[PDB]
Amino acid sequence: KVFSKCELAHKLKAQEMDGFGGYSLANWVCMAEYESNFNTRAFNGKNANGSYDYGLFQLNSKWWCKDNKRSSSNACNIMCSKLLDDNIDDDISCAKRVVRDPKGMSAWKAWVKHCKDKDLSEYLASCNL
Numbered sequence: 697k698v699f700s701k702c703e704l705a706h707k708l709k710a711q712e713m714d715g716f717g718g719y720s721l722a723n724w725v726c727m728a729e730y731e732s733n734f735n736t737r738a739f740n741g742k743n744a745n746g747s748y749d750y751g752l753f754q755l756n757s758k759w760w761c762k763d764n765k766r767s768s769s770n771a772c773n774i775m776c777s778k779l780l781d782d783n784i785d786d787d788i789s790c791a792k793r794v795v796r797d798p799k800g801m802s803a804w805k806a807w808v809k810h811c812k813d814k815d816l817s818e819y820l821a822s823c824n825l
């Protein structure tokens with residue numbers, strides 16, 4: 697599934713992401729745009745580390761989810777394939793676990809590169825009155 701920006705914003709809002717970990721809904725949506733281009737089937741086989749990144753939030757196979765091709769801490773207690781389907785509730789629950797760790801949203805390198813310290817005041821302007 698490929699979300700529209702505003703579709704994703706409203707989904708994330710409904711799952712209590714606005715201000716989650718201190719980060720605005722715009723920040724959460726921005727991370728998704730630059731990590732996966734809003735595509736739930738996004739997949740990066742060789743990360744800079746060596747691990748693989750899965751789904752809308754590009755969750756890695758070393759710390760967060762498990763596939764059976766490398767060792768994983770599997771901190772989200774989830775098969776990596778479940779981050780490639782259309783429904784993102786489990787992706788969201790995992791991203792909530794990820795942000796509470798010491799880097800916060802800087803865990804996501806594409807968020808750091810494209811969204812961090814940027815003015816997102818108009819980023820979700822089309823999604824609300």
Ligand SMILES: [Ca+2]
Nearest residue numbers: 778779783784
């Ligand atoms: Ca999923």
